[PDB]
């Protein structure tokens, strides 16, 4: 896309912080309105601001529009956990159709940590009967957003069969994640325990399920 | 369709009439007949009729006094009048009945009727309600200058109505004149027929006069010769 | 009883009205009656023909209008000298059971005609039958006038005459009859009989004779 | 203060046709304009086009010009100030960057400068291209964990497996247990196959009094799957 | 961002209510019929343009069953009956008794007239079966139907019953919503929507069962109803193609004028010219089944697919039971079998006849009270009118629910036959205060 | 702003903005609609008449009110009362380009008499004692 906005972009909490939405004069801003929406992922986004400064029915003071005759800005003011999100810009006139930027993701600093959860669970009888077995190690409630996945059969790596999803944003601005590790019946019984070893930067959690019980 | 009548020619009082039709050219079965009187001194009174389904509807001024039949073995029609008068002494017709219909609006409403007309007629037939006898006619010759005759019979003195006179059956139609009776004072009735003849034709041709009296019992032929 | 009479000339046109007046919408016959024949349909339906009876005859339609039912005839002749009957039908007064009065039509103006007489002598079998009768037949006469005197020799007879009334015949001629009844011993008492016809024309008579 | 309801999720294959409905209430339907909007993994959010419910006039981006036909039906009224309709987007000549999830949007103002502007969107149609077939899921049950034993809480749920069609949905005991749910996203297997994992957190004395039964829907494939949850634990920290 | 209220007047506000109209006709002179009561002395000049307005975007609710219009329209029809029976005489010394004869419900009645105009003065007039009952029941005499019951006045004979086109019109600061939809159900929003200063041309028919001279339904015919589960309201049909009804009365009837006193003067039936046949409608069975056939399409669609008998009617008095209607001046009852007896399941001509009573003496509207005598017409009567509507009503209580549905002909009501075409209007008051926050301000007074 | 005339009630389906300018339309046939001749009254003038009556005791009443408010004159007028944000809660924007007089006068339906009696009160009945003291001097 043409329209560029910042890649990136961090705040504190209970500051302010400004989002950039430029490009070429053919797409600029000096003969066209610009708009901003909050689109969360996953979810239906939430008009935020239109014809530039003018906000949307609805829309909290926080919010302030800004255009140049180079560039347009977006402030939040007073920054909550819920908007921390991803911000898209878009250039428009009367008759002609809406022109999406680049996007923008929002990290808003110094909020409070969270301790994760994790839980694993073993093959069903009814999926070892099916001749299969899958370890689906599951977490949520997150401070930052990552996570690292490590699995170990015997206290010893696994390397095959490993697949692990991208953390997603809880509804209470948390963050959640799983994975999954897919297995044979024998290497399954072959086996005195299997491992799911979930590593942040503050700490790791293992958590640990046997196949003899 | 021809139709000739038959009837008694005399009646008593307090008796029962009775008259005759035949008919010929067409089927009895399929038409409507019907019976028809005329007094003297007096109009066409309609008696009655009869349907091909054999029901018969009559004027209730004859007092159901009448009687309307077929016969189809014969192709005749009939009728009987009983408990006669004088009143009833008349020449009676027999006639073709047709129905018509005329129709001024909606049939379902009733707001049609029917009506009957006589297209074909009898000559009738001459009947006398009277309580003395029948009487036959005593006929005599009356014999026969222009290049012509006269040639005549007398019918003298017969009771009822009618007689009929012939003369040489067909032959003598040319100039053959039949008058009205007379009326004697005596009640008896008498007229003459004669016929025109040429002189030459006396003497080589023949000439007799037929009288049927049908009412009596009568049958007389009267050679004419001068 | 006294029915209905008419005149009309020869070779006009006759009009004959209807004695009924229909109260509804009318089905009307005219019949034709001479003395001593059958009676004949002359129109039925008002204004229906039968076959063979000429067109000099015609009824009045019923057209709703406000017209009474007439018989017209056309250049009248001595032979449509009858009694005409209306047979009146229509939806008000029921069946029709009346013939209604005709109206006897006479045809004037025709030719008079000179009378023809002819006069019998009693017959030998009347006389050997102790009885007598003169016989004076008049016919062939058109005009309506009559009158028939009997005469024994020269002084006229008032009794023993019996005349017939005169009516018409089948040429359209009047003929009469008169009869003058003898004794055989009265017959052959005078020298002769005559029998006079009078008729608004001219003196006619002839005469017998015992012989 | 109106509501978009969009069809459900679809799976055409590549070069085939599909036909989006997006049925509206609580407005004029007449008054706003009609937006369609997409959003792929590889070209981000896209806007296709805009037709008006009144006029009928439509304007479409360039890149969506020659496989777009956009249509409205009448409105149905309701009230003086309000009505139902309905408005079809068909999109042909599909390709596998076209998958994505697309959206219709209301209008924001009936006149200004920005009046086609989209203000009220969609709950979302994900449209899936692909040449495979569609693959009915498999559930199995997820026997009841510890959460914390001095809190008395524990945590169990229904597994799913190898299903292609992404839309599925999963309740408990027909809408009426809607506290404590977690639903996790599906993962995409090397094999093509996506498979999700649903869990709700209940205290552990609720055994004798209450009944637990995951239901699972799948749209494309119209299989439904009531699976009873076994509340037996095997977990030792649960069994005390 | 400082907002103060602004006042405007005019603004397109306005709120249902219930008004007083007024009558809306064109000008006719009529200088040889002395002015009829319909179209009046002088009740309006018609504006020369109609002049209506599409109100676009504008969504309405109308109710035809809740209208006010109707119960004005009906209560207008009454009162200008009374007023228009006042100056004309009323037959009260005519109660005599009365000696009958028949002329055949039709008989001739002689009696003994009370005048003041030497003493008495004997006449017999031509009255039909309906206007007479027996006393002595051994037909010596006979009275009026009516001298038991209530007064009776004689309508005028100058005054006509021929309906003409009225348009009822609103005050100002009013206005009238006319609803545009074709398949407009019976009550409900209507998208379409047109405002109108006056209705349009409602001619007052007065009929029982069918509705006569009406309107008809634009593309496909329309059933309206106040409720269709429930029996007990009466079924309202308008249908796209007008069928034609011809009546007639083949008597060629006679007026004879008769004297009471000074000014009053009866007029009698005179003896009839020409035949007596009674009075019959003819209506076209092609069009009356191909008509029958479109109304049970939309029927069912009430009920399942398939479930529908027409029977006749069965209750009230001889009033309601027979379609009651006027032209050319005499009141007829019909009888409707012939159209009301068929059945219809799984989805050669012959003209239907029906027979037509004549009734001379009415109570309309339910009204127990002044009665009005119908003079005689004279002359044989022909009337060709447009059929448009029907008004129909169940049976009911039905074991075998949708095992058959049986429609049979009623008239509980004469304002059925005002809301067969005030459906489509609506009586609003308009309220031009409207008052709005903008970013303006008075010019301060400090 | 419209010069497009569409009649009476024309721009009831329009916006507020786009129905404000047009209310010449709406307020001359408010008051002009008067049977001019051949009237007889029998159970109708007596109906007709009051109706032309009612329509001008309502029309001298909303006269009265624009009396008591300063406007008698005008039918646009400003005033000094402060829009309360617990009547509507929407911007100007939303308001005159995005809804219509009908649709808002429900809105608002609920404080129209609140607010009449603040604007008989607050500002003319206030204004008129601050006029007198302005040209006082
Ligand atoms: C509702 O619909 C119904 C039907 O659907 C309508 O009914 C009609 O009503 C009118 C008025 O009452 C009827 O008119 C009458 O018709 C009589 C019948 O005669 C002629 O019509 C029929 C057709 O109906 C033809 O078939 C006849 O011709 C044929 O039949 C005769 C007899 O077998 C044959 O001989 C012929 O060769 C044909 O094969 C006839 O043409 C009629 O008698 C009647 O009376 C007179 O009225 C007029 C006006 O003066 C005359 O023109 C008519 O001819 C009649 O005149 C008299 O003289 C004629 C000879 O000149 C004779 O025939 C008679 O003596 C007759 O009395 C009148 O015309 C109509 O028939 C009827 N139609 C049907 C199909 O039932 C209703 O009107 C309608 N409702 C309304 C309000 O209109
Ligand atoms: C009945 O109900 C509907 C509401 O659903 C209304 O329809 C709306 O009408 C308004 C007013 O006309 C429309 O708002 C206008 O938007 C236009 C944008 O359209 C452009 O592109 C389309 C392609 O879809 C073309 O058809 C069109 O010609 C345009 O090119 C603007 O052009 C309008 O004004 C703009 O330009 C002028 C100067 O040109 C500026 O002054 C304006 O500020 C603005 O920038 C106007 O904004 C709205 O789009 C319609 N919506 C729908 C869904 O149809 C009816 O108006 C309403 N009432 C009546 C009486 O019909
Ligand atoms: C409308 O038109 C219809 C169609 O003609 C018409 O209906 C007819 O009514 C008469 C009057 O009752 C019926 O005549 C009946 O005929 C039967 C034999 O066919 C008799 O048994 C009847 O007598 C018994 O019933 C009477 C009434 O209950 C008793 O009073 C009586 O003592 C006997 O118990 C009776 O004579 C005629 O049959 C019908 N028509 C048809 C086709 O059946 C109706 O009158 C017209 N008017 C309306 C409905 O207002
Ligand atoms: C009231 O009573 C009188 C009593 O006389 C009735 O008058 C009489 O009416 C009849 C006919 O109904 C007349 O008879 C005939 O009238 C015809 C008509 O053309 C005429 O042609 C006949 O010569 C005959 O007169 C009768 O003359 C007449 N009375 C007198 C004295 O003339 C009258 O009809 C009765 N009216 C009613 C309505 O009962
Ligand atoms: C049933 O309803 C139809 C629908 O209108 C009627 O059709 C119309 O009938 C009339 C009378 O028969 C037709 O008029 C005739 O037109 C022809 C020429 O087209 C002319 O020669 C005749 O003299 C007569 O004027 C008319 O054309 C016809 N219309 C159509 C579109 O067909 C029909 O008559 C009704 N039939 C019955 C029995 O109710
Ligand atoms: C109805 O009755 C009237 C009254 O008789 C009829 O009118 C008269 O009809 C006759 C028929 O020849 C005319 O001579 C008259 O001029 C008509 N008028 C008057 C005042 O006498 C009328 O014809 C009848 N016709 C119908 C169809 O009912
Ligand atoms: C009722 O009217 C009739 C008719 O005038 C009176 O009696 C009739 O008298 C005529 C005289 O010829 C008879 O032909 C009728 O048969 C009589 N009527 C009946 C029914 O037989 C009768 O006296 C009158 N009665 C009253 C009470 O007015
Ligand atoms: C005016 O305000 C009243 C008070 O809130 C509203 O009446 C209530 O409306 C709610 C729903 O909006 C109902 O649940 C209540 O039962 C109503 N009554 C009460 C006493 O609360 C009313 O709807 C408002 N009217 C308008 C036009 O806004
Ligand atoms: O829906 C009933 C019936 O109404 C009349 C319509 N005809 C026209 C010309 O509109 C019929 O097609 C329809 O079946
Ligand atoms: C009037 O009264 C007389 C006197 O009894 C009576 O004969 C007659 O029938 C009554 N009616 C008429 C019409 O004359
Ligand atoms: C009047 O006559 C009618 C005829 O049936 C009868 O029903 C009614 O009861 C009578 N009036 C009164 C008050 O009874
Ligand atoms: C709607 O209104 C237009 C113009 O006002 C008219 O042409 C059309 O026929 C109407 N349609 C309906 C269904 O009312
Ligand atoms: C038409 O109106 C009737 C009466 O209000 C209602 O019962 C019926 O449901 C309506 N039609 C439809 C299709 O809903
Ligand atoms: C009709 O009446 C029934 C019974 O009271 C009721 O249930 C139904 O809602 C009514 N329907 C209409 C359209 O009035
Ligand atoms: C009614 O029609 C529908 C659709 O054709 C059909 O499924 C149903 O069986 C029909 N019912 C009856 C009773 O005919
Ligand atoms: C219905 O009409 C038919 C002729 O179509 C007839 O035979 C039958 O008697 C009628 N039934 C009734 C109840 O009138
Ligand atoms: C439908 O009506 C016809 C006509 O009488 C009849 O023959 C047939 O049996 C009926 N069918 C049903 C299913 O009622
Ligand atoms: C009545 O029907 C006739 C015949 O189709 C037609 O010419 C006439 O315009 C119709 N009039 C009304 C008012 O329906
Ligand atoms: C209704 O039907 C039931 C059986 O279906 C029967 O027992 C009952 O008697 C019926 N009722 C009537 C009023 O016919
Ligand atoms: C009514 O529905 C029943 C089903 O219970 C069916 O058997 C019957 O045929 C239907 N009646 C009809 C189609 O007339
Ligand atoms: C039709 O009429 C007959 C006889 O009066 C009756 O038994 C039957 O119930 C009626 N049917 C309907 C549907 O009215």
């Known amino acids: 896309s043409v329209l560029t906005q910042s890649a990136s972009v961090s705040g504190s909490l209970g500051q302010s912080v400004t989002i950039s939405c430029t490009g070429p004069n053919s797409v600029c801003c000096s003969h066209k309105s610009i708009s901003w929406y909050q689109w969360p992922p996953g979810r239906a986004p939430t008009l935020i601001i239109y014809e530039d400064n003018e906000r949307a029915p609805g829309i909290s003071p926080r919010f302030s529009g800004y255009k140049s005759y180079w560039s347009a800005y977006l402030t939040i003011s007073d920054l909550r956990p819920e908007d921390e999100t991803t911000y898209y810009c878009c250039s428009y006139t009367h008759n002609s159709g809406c022109v999406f930027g680049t996007g923008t993701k929002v990290s808003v600093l110094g909020q409070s940590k969270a301790n994760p959860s994790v839980t694993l669970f073993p093959p069903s009888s009814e999926e070892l009967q099916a001749n299969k077995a899958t370890l689906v190690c599951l977490i949520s409630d997150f401070y930052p957003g990552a996570v690292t996945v490590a699995w170990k059969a015997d206290s010893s790596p696994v390397k095959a069969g490993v697949e692990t999803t991208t953390p997603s944003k809880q509804s209470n601005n948390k963050y959640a994640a799983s994975s999954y590790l897919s297995l044979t019946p024998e290497q399954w019984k072959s086996h005195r325990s299997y491992s799911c070893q979930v590593t942040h930067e503050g700490s790791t959690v293992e958590k640990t399920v046997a196949p003899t019980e | 369709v021809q139709l000739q009548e038959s009837g008694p020619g005399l009646v008593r009082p307090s008796e029962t009439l009775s008259v005759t039709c035949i008919v010929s050219?067409?089927?009895?079965?399929?038409?409507?007949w019907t019976w028809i009187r005329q007094s003297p001194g007096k109009g066409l009174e309609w008696i009655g009729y009869?349907?091909?389904?054999?029901?018969?509807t009559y004027n209730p001024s004859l007092n159901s006094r009448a009687v309307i039949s077929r016969d189809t073995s014969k192709n005749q029609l009939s009728l009987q009048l009983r408990s006669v008068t004088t009143a009833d002494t008349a020449i009676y017709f027999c006639?073709?009945?047709?129905?018509?219909?005329?129709?001024?609006?909606?049939?379902?409403?009733?707001?049609?009727?029917?009506?009957?007309?006589?297209?074909?007629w009898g000559k009738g037939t001459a009947v006398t309600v009277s309580s003395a006898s029948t009487k036959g006619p005593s006929v005599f010759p009356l014999a026969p200058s222009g290049g012509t005759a006269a040639l005549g019979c007398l019918v003298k003195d017969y009771f009822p109505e009618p007689v009929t006179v012939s003369w040489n059956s067909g032959a003598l139609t040319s100039g053959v004149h039949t008058f009205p009776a007379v009326l004697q004072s005596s009640g008896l009735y008498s007229l003459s027929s004669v016929v025109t003849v040429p002189s030459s034709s006396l003497g080589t041709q023949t000439y007799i006069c037929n009288v049927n009296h049908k009412p009596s019992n009568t049958k007389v032929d009267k050679k004419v010769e001068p | 009883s006294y029915v209905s009479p008419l005149s009309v000339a020869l070779g006009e046109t006759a009009r004959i009205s209807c004695g009924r007046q229909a109260l509804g919408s009318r089905a009307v016959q005219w019949y034709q009656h001479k003395p001593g024949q059958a009676p004949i349909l002359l129109i039925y339906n008002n204004q229906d023909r039968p076959s063979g009876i000429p067109e000099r005859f015609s009824g009045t339609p019923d057209i709703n209008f406000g017209t009474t039912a007439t018989l017209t005839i056309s250049g009248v002749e001595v032979g449509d000298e009858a009694d005409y009957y209306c047979h009146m039908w229509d939806s008000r007064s029921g069946f029709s059971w009346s013939f209604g009065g005709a109206t006897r039509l006479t045809v004037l103006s025709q030719p008079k005609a000179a009378p023809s007489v002819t006069l019998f002598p009693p017959s030998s079998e009347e006389l050997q039958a102790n009885k007598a009768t003169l016989v004076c037949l008049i016919s062939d006469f058109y005009p309506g006038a009559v009158t028939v005197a009997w005469k024994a020799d020269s002084s006229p007879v008032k009794a023993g005459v019996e005349t017939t009334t005169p009516s018409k015949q089948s040429n359209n001629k009047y003929a009469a009859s008169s009869y003058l009844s003898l004794t055989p011993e009265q017959w052959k008492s005078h020298k002769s009989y005559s029998c006079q016809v009078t008729h608004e024309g001219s003196t006619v008579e002839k005469t017998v004779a015992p012989t | 203060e109106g509501q978009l309801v969009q069809s459900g999720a679809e799976l055409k294959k590549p070069g085939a046709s599909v036909k989006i409905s997006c049925k509206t209430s609580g407005y004029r339907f007449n008054f706003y304009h009609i937006n369609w909007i997409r959003q792929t993994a590889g070209r981000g959010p896209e806007w296709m086009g805009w037709i008006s419910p009144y006029s009928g006039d439509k304007n479409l981006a360039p890149a969506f010009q020659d496989r777009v036909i956009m249509t409205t039906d009448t409105e149905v009224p309701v009230t003086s100030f309000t009505s139902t309709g309905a408005a079809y987007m068909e999109i042909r000549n599909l390709k596998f960057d076209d998958t994505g999830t697309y959206f219709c949007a209301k209008g924001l103002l009936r006149d200004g400068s920005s009046t086609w502007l989209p203000y009220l969107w969609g709950q979302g149609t994900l449209l899936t291209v692909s040449s495979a077939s569609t693959k009915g899921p498999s559930v199995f049950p997820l026997a009841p964990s510890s959460k914390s034993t001095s809190g008395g809480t524990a945590a169990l749920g229904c597994l799913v497996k190898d299903y292609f069609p992404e839309p599925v949905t999963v309740s408990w005991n027909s809408g009426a247990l809607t506290s404590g749910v977690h639903t996790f996203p599906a993962v995409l297997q090397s094999s093509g196959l996506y498979s999700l994992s649903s869990v709700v957190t209940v205290p552990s004395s609720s055994l004798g009094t209450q009944t637990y039964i995951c239901n699972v829907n799948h749209k494309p494939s119209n299989t439904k799957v009531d699976k009873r949850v076994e509340p037996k634990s095997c977990d030792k920290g649960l069994e005390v | 961002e400082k907002l103060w209220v602004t006042v405007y007047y005019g603004v397109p506000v306005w709120k249902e209510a219930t008004t007083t109209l007024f009558c809306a006709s064109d000008a006719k002179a009529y200088d040889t019929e002395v002015h009829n009561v319909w179209a009046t002395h002088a009740c309006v000049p018609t504006d020369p343009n109609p002049q209506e307005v599409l109100l676009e975007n504008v969504t309405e609710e109308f109710n035809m069953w809740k209208n006010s219009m109707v119960e004005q329209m009906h209560e207008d029809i009454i009162s200008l009956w009374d007023q228009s029976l006042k100056p004309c005489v009323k037959l009260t010394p005519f109660c005599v008794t009365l000696n009958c004869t028949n002329y055949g419900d039709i008989k001739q009645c002689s009696f003994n007239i009370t005048t003041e105009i030497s003493k008495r003065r004997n006449e017999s007039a031509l009255f039909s079966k309906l206007d007479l009952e027996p006393i002595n029941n051994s037909n010596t005499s006979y009275r009026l139907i009516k001298c038991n019951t209530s007064v009776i006045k004689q309508a005028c004979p100058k005054v006509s019953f021929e309906p003409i086109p009225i348009h009822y019109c609103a005050p100002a600061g009013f206005a009238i919503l006319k609803c545009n939809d074709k398949r407009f159900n019976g009550t409900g929003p209507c998208k379409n929507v047109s405002t109108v200063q006056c209705t349009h041309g409602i001619k007052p028919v007065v009929s029982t069962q069918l509705l006569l001279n009406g309107s008809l339904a634009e593309e496909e015919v329309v059933i309206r109803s106040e409720n269709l589960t429930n029996n007990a309201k009466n079924i309202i049909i308008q249908l796209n193609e007008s069928v034609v009804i011809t009546c007639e009365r083949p008597n060629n009837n006679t007026r004879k004028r008769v004297t009471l006193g000074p000014g009053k003067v009866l007029y009698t039936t005179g003896e009839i010219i020409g035949n007596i046949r009674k009075a019959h409608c003819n209506i076209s069975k092609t069009n009356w089944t191909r008509t029958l056939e479109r109304i049970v399409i939309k029927l069912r669609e009430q009920f399942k697919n398939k479930t529908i008998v027409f029977n006749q009617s069965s209750g009230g008095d001889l009033e309601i039971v027979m379609h009651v209607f006027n032209c050319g001046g005499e009141f007829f009852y019909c009888n409707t079998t012939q159209l009301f007896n068929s059945t219809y399941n799984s989805t050669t001509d012959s003209i239907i006849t029906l027979p037509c009573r004549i009734k001379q003496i009415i109570n309309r509207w339910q009204e127990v009270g002044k009665a009005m005598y119908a003079p005689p017409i004279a002359g044989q009567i022909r009337c060709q009118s447009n059929i448009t509507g029907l008004i129909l009503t169940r049976d009911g209580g039905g074991n075998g629910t949708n095992g058959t549905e049986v429609f049979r002909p009623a008239g509980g009501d004469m304002k059925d036959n005002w809301r067969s075409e005030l459906y489509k209007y609506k009586v609003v008051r308009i309220e031009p205060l409207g008052i709005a926050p903008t970013k303006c301000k008075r010019r301060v007074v400090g | 702003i419209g010069a497009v005339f569409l009649g009476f009630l024309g721009a009831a389906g329009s916006t507020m903005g786009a129905a404000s300018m047009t209310l010449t339309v709406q307020a001359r046939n408010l008051l002009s609609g008067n049977p001019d001749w051949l009237p007889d009254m029998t159970v109708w003038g007596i109906k007709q008449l009051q109706a032309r009556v009612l329509a001008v005791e309502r029309y001298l009443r909303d006269q009265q009110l624009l009396g008591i408010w300063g406007c008698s004159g005008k039918l646009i007028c400003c005033t000094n009362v402060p829009w309360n944000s617990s009547w509507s809660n929407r911007n100007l924007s939303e308001i005159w380009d995005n809804m219509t007089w009908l649709q808002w006068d429900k809105e608002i339906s609920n404080y129209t008499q609140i607010i009449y009696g603040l604007l008989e009160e607050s500002q003319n009945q206030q204004e008129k004692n601050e006029q007198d003291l302005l040209a006082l001097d």
């Open positions: 050219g067409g089927s009895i079965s399929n038409y409507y």
């Open positions: 009869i349907s091909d389904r054999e029901t018969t």
């Open positions: 006639a073709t009945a047709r129905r018509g219909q005329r129709i001024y609006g909606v049939v379902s409403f009733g707001e049609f009727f029917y009506y009957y007309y006589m297209d074909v």
